[PDB]
Swiss-Prot record:
Reaction it catalyzes: 2-deoxy-D-ribose 5-phosphate = D-glyceraldehyde 3-phosphate + acetaldehyde
Result, substituting K137L: 20-fold decrease in catalytic efficiency
HAMAP family in the record: DeoC_type2 (MF_00592)
Protein source organism: Escherichia coli (strain K12)
Mutation effect (D102L): 2000-fold decrease in catalytic efficiency
Residue positions where N6-acetyllysine is found in the record: K167
Protein name stated in the entry: Deoxyribose-phosphate aldolase
Stored Pfam families: DeoC
UniProt-recorded Gene Ontology molecular function terms: deoxyribose-phosphate aldolase activity; lyase activity
EC id: 4.1.2.4
Matching NCBIfam families: deoC
Length: 250
């Protein structure tokens, strides 16, 4: 047993195994579901576009892993400031059968000085999700926000509005998760004293076992090594799984 082996098994079990591509099909999503069932255990979740939720649910059930959660995305990837649209998409995700909805915060509106629309958008989507026993993650798009003060503010607004998780990135812009962005966002969780109710999810560009290991190190430093369970930590990733399995001998 090695520190890398220990972190890699932990990371595997925290993955939101993702496919969000223009050419996605049912077949591709079925294959993803099979990939999430590994010889050492299951990923925490899959993350797919809403229209694929019903076929994914059926696939996960037939292979005997109904406990793999189904996450999806709304207001995505653009993070527009139309609350009605974000909410309608979130209600549709719930109706398809999502376990978790990852909504994009209206980051450009924040950058232009409008803090209120992000509060209102997150709150509206949280209310819909909580009524359905669905978890809400909020994607703030740290690579577009760029400045520490704006990363902190988007995190704070999201948490105040009811986010169950704060997530770095869509994976669809040039810059996604970084260790510094992860530290900033986790410091907000710490500063607001919301460790019990808010998780953290780095997403985009987390490609290798060693990458995953960098992010868990930060969590363990800040909150102790027991904090990062599946309710409090996820990896938004794809290729990372194969890297983790190699680190583990599988």
């Amino acid at each position: 047993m090695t520190d890398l082996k220990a972190s890699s098994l932990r990371a595997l079990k925290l993955m939101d195994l993702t496919t969000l591509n223009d050419d996605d099909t049912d077949e591709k999503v079925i294959a993803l579901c099979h990939q999430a069932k590994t010889p050492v255990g299951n990923t925490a979740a899959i993350c797919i576009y809403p229209r694929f939720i019903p076929i994914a649910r059926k696939t996960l059930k037939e292979q005997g892993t109904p406990e793999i959660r189904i996450a999806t995305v709304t207001n995505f990837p653009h993070g527009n400031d139309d609350i009605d649209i974000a909410l309608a998409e979130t209600r549709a995700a719930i109706a398809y059968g999502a376990d978790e909805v990852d909504v994009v915060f209206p980051y450009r509106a924040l950058m232009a000085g409008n803090e209120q629309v992000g509060f209102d958008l997150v709150k509206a989507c949280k209310e819909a999700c909580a009524a359905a026993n669905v978890l809400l993650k909020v994607i703030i798009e740290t690579g577009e926000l760029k400045d520490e003060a704006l990363i902190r503010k988007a995190s704070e607004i999201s948490i105040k509005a009811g986010a169950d998780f704060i997530k770095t990135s869509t994976g669809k812009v040039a810059v996604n998760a970084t260790p510094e962005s992860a530290r900033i966002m986790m410091e907000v969780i710490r500063d607001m004293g919301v460790e019990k109710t808010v998780g953290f999810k780095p997403a985009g560009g987390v490609r290798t076992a060693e990458d995953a290991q960098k992010y868990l190190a930060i969590a363990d430093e800040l909150f102790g090594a027991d904090w990062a369970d599946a309710r409090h930590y996820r990896f938004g990733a794809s290729s990372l799984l194969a890297s983790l399995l190699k680190a583990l001998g599988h």
